[PDB]
């Protein structure tokens, strides 16, 4: 149906605005972080403590396939992110602070990705 494809048009135009926040996130963590699935041939017992892990590249992949119907799903995965390393790690160690530190300025980028996606539709 012509209704179809509009539905499409308006997700793919969603995974392009998503993409370009996506970039700017990851700005954020210039250290790379985040940027990969935390190994678990290196943190063997890591699903023992974290039952949902999440990693850029793995949002990534989901975007790329459109998988990402609206903003909040998106933020979803950028909230666990931020959220599984924040209970995994200390307070004093290098990894806990690049996820306050990326969380925060991630803050301004989406407030603003909000008012883009609910103005343009």
């Given at each position: 149906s012509m209704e179809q494809v509009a539905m499409e048009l308006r997700l793919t135009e969603l995974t392009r605005l998503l993409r370009s926040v996506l970039d700017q996130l990851q700005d954020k963590d210039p250290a790379r972080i985040?940027?990969?699935?935390?190994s678990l041939k290196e943190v063997p017992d890591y699903l023992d403590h974290i039952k949902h892990p999440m990693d850029f590249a793995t949002m990534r992949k989901r975007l790329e396939a459109?998988?990402?119907?609206?903003l909040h799903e998106f933020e979803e995965d950028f909230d666990l992110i931020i959220d599984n390393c924040m209970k995994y790690n200390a307070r004093d160690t290098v990894f806990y602070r690049a996820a306050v530190r990326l969380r925060d300025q991630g803050g301004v980028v989406l407030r603003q990705a909000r008012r883009e996606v609910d103005s343009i539709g």
């Open positions: 985040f940027a990969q699935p935390v459109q998988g990402y119907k609206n």
